[PDB]
Enzyme design. Structure first.
Site, PDB file in Angstrom:
ATOM      1  N   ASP A  35      -3.676   9.763  15.352  1.00  0.00           N
ATOM      2  CA  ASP A  35      -4.104   9.457  13.985  1.00  0.00           C
ATOM      3  C   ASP A  35      -4.901   8.148  13.893  1.00  0.00           C
ATOM      4  O   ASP A  35      -4.726   7.384  12.949  1.00  0.00           O
ATOM      5  CB  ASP A  35      -2.916   9.432  13.020  1.00  0.00           C
ATOM      6  CG  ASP A  35      -3.346   9.505  11.560  1.00  0.00           C
ATOM      7  OD1 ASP A  35      -4.506   9.878  11.296  1.00  0.00           O
ATOM      8  OD2 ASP A  35      -2.524   9.192  10.678  1.00  0.00           O
TER       9      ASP A  35
ATOM     10  N   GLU B 277       5.403   4.915   1.384  1.00  0.00           N
ATOM     11  CA  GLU B 277       5.167   3.790   0.448  1.00  0.00           C
ATOM     12  C   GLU B 277       5.525   2.485   1.179  1.00  0.00           C
ATOM     13  O   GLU B 277       6.587   2.397   1.805  1.00  0.00           O
ATOM     14  CB  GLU B 277       5.997   3.926  -0.835  1.00  0.00           C
ATOM     15  CG  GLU B 277       5.487   5.003  -1.779  1.00  0.00           C
ATOM     16  CD  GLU B 277       6.407   5.386  -2.922  1.00  0.00           C
ATOM     17  OE1 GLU B 277       7.544   4.866  -2.989  1.00  0.00           O
ATOM     18  OE2 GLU B 277       5.990   6.230  -3.748  1.00  0.00           O
TER      19      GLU B 277
ATOM     20  N   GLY C  58       0.807  -1.211   0.000  1.00  0.00           N
ATOM     21  CA  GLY C  58       0.000   0.000   0.000  1.00  0.00           C
ATOM     22  C   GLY C  58       0.837   1.257   0.000  1.00  0.00           C
ATOM     23  O   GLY C  58       2.030   1.210  -0.305  1.00  0.00           O
ATOM     24  N   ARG C  59       0.216   2.395   0.333  1.00  0.00           N
ATOM     25  CA  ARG C  59       0.906   3.683   0.338  1.00  0.00           C
ATOM     26  C   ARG C  59       0.201   4.752   1.176  1.00  0.00           C
ATOM     27  O   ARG C  59      -0.595   4.431   2.059  1.00  0.00           O
ATOM     28  CB  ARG C  59       1.182   4.188  -1.102  1.00  0.00           C
ATOM     29  CG  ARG C  59      -0.043   4.241  -2.032  1.00  0.00           C
ATOM     30  CD  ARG C  59      -0.076   5.484  -2.914  1.00  0.00           C
ATOM     31  NE  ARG C  59       1.233   5.811  -3.490  1.00  0.00           N
ATOM     32  CZ  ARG C  59       1.710   5.313  -4.628  1.00  0.00           C
ATOM     33  NH1 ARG C  59       0.987   4.460  -5.343  1.00  0.00           N
ATOM     34  NH2 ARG C  59       2.911   5.670  -5.062  1.00  0.00           N
TER      35      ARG C  59
HETATM   36 CL1  LIG Z   1      -9.503  -1.636  12.834  1.00  0.00          CL
HETATM   37  C1  LIG Z   1      -9.899  -2.097  11.212  1.00  0.00           C
HETATM   38  C2  LIG Z   1      -8.880  -2.271  10.297  1.00  0.00           C
HETATM   39  C3  LIG Z   1      -9.169  -2.588   8.973  1.00  0.00           C
HETATM   40  C4  LIG Z   1      -8.061  -2.825   7.974  1.00  0.00           C
HETATM   41  N1  LIG Z   1      -7.228  -1.636   7.752  1.00  0.00           N
HETATM   42  C5  LIG Z   1      -6.144  -1.846   6.775  1.00  0.00           C
HETATM   43  C6  LIG Z   1      -5.177  -0.728   7.116  1.00  0.00           C
HETATM   44  C7  LIG Z   1      -3.925  -0.698   6.303  1.00  0.00           C
HETATM   45  N2  LIG Z   1      -3.148   0.361   6.187  1.00  0.00           N
HETATM   46  C8  LIG Z   1      -2.089  -0.054   5.385  1.00  0.00           C
HETATM   47  C9  LIG Z   1      -0.976   0.645   4.916  1.00  0.00           C
HETATM   48  C10 LIG Z   1      -0.066  -0.013   4.096  1.00  0.00           C
HETATM   49  C11 LIG Z   1      -0.253  -1.357   3.754  1.00  0.00           C
HETATM   50  C12 LIG Z   1      -1.355  -2.061   4.220  1.00  0.00           C
HETATM   51  C13 LIG Z   1      -2.268  -1.390   5.030  1.00  0.00           C
HETATM   52  N3  LIG Z   1      -3.455  -1.774   5.628  1.00  0.00           N
HETATM   53  C14 LIG Z   1     -10.503  -2.717   8.599  1.00  0.00           C
HETATM   54  C15 LIG Z   1     -11.510  -2.562   9.535  1.00  0.00           C
HETATM   55 CL2  LIG Z   1     -13.150  -2.784   9.014  1.00  0.00          CL
HETATM   56  C16 LIG Z   1     -11.239  -2.251  10.873  1.00  0.00           C
HETATM   57  C17 LIG Z   1     -12.310  -2.146  11.908  1.00  0.00           C
HETATM   58  C18 LIG Z   1     -13.023  -0.958  12.083  1.00  0.00           C
HETATM   59  C19 LIG Z   1     -13.939  -0.828  13.118  1.00  0.00           C
HETATM   60  C20 LIG Z   1     -14.165  -1.881  13.988  1.00  0.00           C
HETATM   61  C21 LIG Z   1     -13.456  -3.058  13.836  1.00  0.00           C
HETATM   62  C22 LIG Z   1     -12.537  -3.192  12.805  1.00  0.00           C
END
Ligand SMILES: Clc1cc(C[NH2+]CCc2nc3ccccc3[nH]2)cc(Cl)c1-c1ccccc1
Ligand SMILES: Clc1cc(C[NH2+]CCc2nc3ccccc3[nH]2)cc(Cl)c1-c1ccccc1
Ligand SMILES: Clc1cc(C[NH2+]CCc2nc3ccccc3[nH]2)cc(Cl)c1-c1ccccc1
Length: 327
Positions: free
Chosen positions: A154, A50, A44-45
Site C-alpha cells: 500500500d 481514525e 487524520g483518518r
Molecule cells: Cl513520502 C511523502 C509524504 C508526505 C506526507 N504524507 C502525510 C501522510 C499521512 N497519513 C496520515 C494519516 C493519519 C494522520 C496523519 C497522516 N499523515 C508528503 C509527500 Cl510530498 C511525500 C513525498 C512524495 C514523493 C517524494 C518525496 C516525498
C-alpha cells in the site's frame, strides 16, 4: 495457465524463519490498558481507521492512537505481527501498544509520536534535493521490510509521515502488508487504485516485493511532474488504460505474453493501441526544476510492466539520482 514467478531477491527469507514469525494466526495478542491514554486531538483518518494524538499518562509522553474500523480490525493479527517483526527497523513506525475499547470492543494500535509536517505543504514545497533525500529514506524502509520477507502492498504519500524539521520519515499503515512466500497466489485487491501495479490490474496473483517499487515509481512521477495522481484511472480497467497511454501497449502485450496472462474479452477495444511516450512530454515550465536525466532514468527503471525487471529497493539506492544526497 499463467507462468509462475518468484522474487529475484529475498526469495527464501520466510522459509528459514521459525513458523511463529509468519504464522500470524497463531500469534496471541497481549492487550494493554487503554486507560493509559488520553486522546488530545485528531490528526487524520481513513476508510480503515481514525488517528488521534494522545498522551501516555504512565510516562507523560506523546503517542499516536489508530482506532481500527471493522474492515482493518479483521486482519489485526497480521498487522500486529508485521509491526512487531519490523519494529526497530530503519524508518519503520514503532508500535508501542495494542488496546481494546471495552464499550465498543473496537481495537486500537498505539504508535511512537511523529511531529508530521502538513501533507499539502510537503507536496507543494519540497525541493529537488528534498525529493531525492526523502525517496532514499523510503528506500531504506522498503529494503528493510523486503529483506524481512514482507511487502507493504500500500505504498503512497498518505502512508509516509514526514517530520520535515528533523528530516525524519516513517513508513506507516501496515494493514495491507503481507509475508512473501514464493509461489503463493495473493489477493490483487491491494493498495490504492492510482498506485496499483499492472500485475494487480491484469489479475496476476503470483506477485512480490516488486509491487512496492511500482507504487514508489507512481509517487515519484506525481511529485516530479506535479501531476496528482500520475495515472488517473476512473476504475481498475481504466487504470491499466491510463498506464498504457504512457508506457505503450506493445510492452504491455509483451508482458502478458511472457507470463501467459489472460485478459478480459474486450481487451483490444479497452486498451486500443498506444505508443510508449517520451518522459519529456510531461516536462513543463512549472515542473522543470524537479526533473533531471537521473530522475527520468530512475523513474524509467521503476515503472516497467514486468515486475521482474524493475529495480529492487537495494538497486534503487545505488542509482545516480541519489549521488547528490548526503549519506
Ligand atoms: Cl513520502 C511523502 C509524504 C508526505 C506526507 N504524507 C502525510 C501522510 C499521512 N497519513 C496520515 C494519516 C493519519 C494522520 C496523519 C497522516 N499523515 C508528503 C509527500 Cl510530498 C511525500 C513525498 C512524495 C514523493 C517524494 C518525496 C516525498
Ligand atoms: Cl475506550 C478508550 C479509552 C481511553 C481512555 N480515556 C481517553 C479519554 C479521551 C483511551 C482509548 Cl485509546 C480508548 C480506546 C478507543 C477506541 C479503541 C480502543 C481504545
Ligand atoms: Cl475472461 C478472463 C478474465 C480474467 C480476469 N482478469 C482480467 C484482466 C484484465 N484486466 C484488464 C484491464 C483492462 C483491459 C483488459 C483487462 N483484462 C481472467 C481470465 Cl483467466 C480470463 C480468461 C480469458 C480467456 C480464457 C480463459 C480465461
Amino acid at each position: 495457465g499463467p507462468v509462475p514467478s518468484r522474487a529475484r531477491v529475498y526469495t527464501d527469507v520466510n522459509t528459514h524463519r521459525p513458523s511463529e514469525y509468519w504464522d500470524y494466526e497463531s500469534h496471541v495478542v497481549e492487550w494493554g490498558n487503554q486507560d493509559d491514554y488520553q486522546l488530545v486531538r485528531k490528526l487524520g483518518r481513513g476508510k480503515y481507521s481514525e488517528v488521534f494524538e494522545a498522551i501516555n499518562i504512565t510516562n507523560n509522553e506523546k503517542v499516536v492512537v489508530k482506532i481500527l474500523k471493522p474492515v482493518a480490525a479483521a486482519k489485526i493479527k497480521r498487522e500486529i505481527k508485521i509491526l512487531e517483526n519490523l519494529r526497530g527497523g530503519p524508518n519503520i513506525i514503532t508500535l508501542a501498544d495494542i488496546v481494546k475499547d471495552p464499550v465498543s470492543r473496537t481495537p486500537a494500535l498505539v504508535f511512537e509520536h511523529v511531529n508530521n509536517t502538513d501533507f499539502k505543504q510537503l507536496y507543494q514545497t519540497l525541493t529537488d534535493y528534498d525529493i531525492r533525500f526523502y525517496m532514499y529514506e523510503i528506500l531504506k524502509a522498503l529494503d528493510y521490510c523486503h529483506s524481512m520477507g514482507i511487502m507493504h502492498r500500500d505504498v503512497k504519500p498518505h502512508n509516509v509521515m514526514i517530520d520535515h524539521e528533523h528530516r525524519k520519515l516513517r513508513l506507516i499503515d501496515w494493514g495491507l502488508a503481507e509475508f512473501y512466500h514464493p509461489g503463493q497466489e495473493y489477493n490483487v485487491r491491494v493498495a490504492s487504485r492510482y498506485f496499483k501495479g499492472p500485475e494487480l490490474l491484469v489479475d496476476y496473483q503470483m506477485y512480490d516485493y516488486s509491487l512496492d517499487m511500482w507504487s514508489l515509481g507512481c509517487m515519484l512521477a506525481s511529485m516530479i511532474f506535479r501531476k496528482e495522481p500520475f495515472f488517473h484511472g476512473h476504475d481498475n480497467y481504466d487504470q491499466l488504460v491510463r498506464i498504457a497511454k504512457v508506457l505503450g501497449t506493445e510492452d504491455l502485450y509483451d508482458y502478458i505474453d511472457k507470463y501467459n496472462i489472460e485478459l478480459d474479452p474486450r481487451f483490444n477495444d479497452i486498451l486500443g493501441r498506444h505508443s510508449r511516450k517520451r518522459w519529456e512530454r510531461f516536462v513543463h515550465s512549472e515542473n522543470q526544476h524537479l526533473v533531471s536525466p537521473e530522475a527520468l532514468d530512475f523513474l524509467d527503471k521503476l515503472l516497467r510492466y514486468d515486475h521482474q525487471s524493475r529495480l529492487t529497493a537495494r538497486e534503487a539506492m545505488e542509482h545516480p539520482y541519489f549521488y547528490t544526497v548526503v549519506k
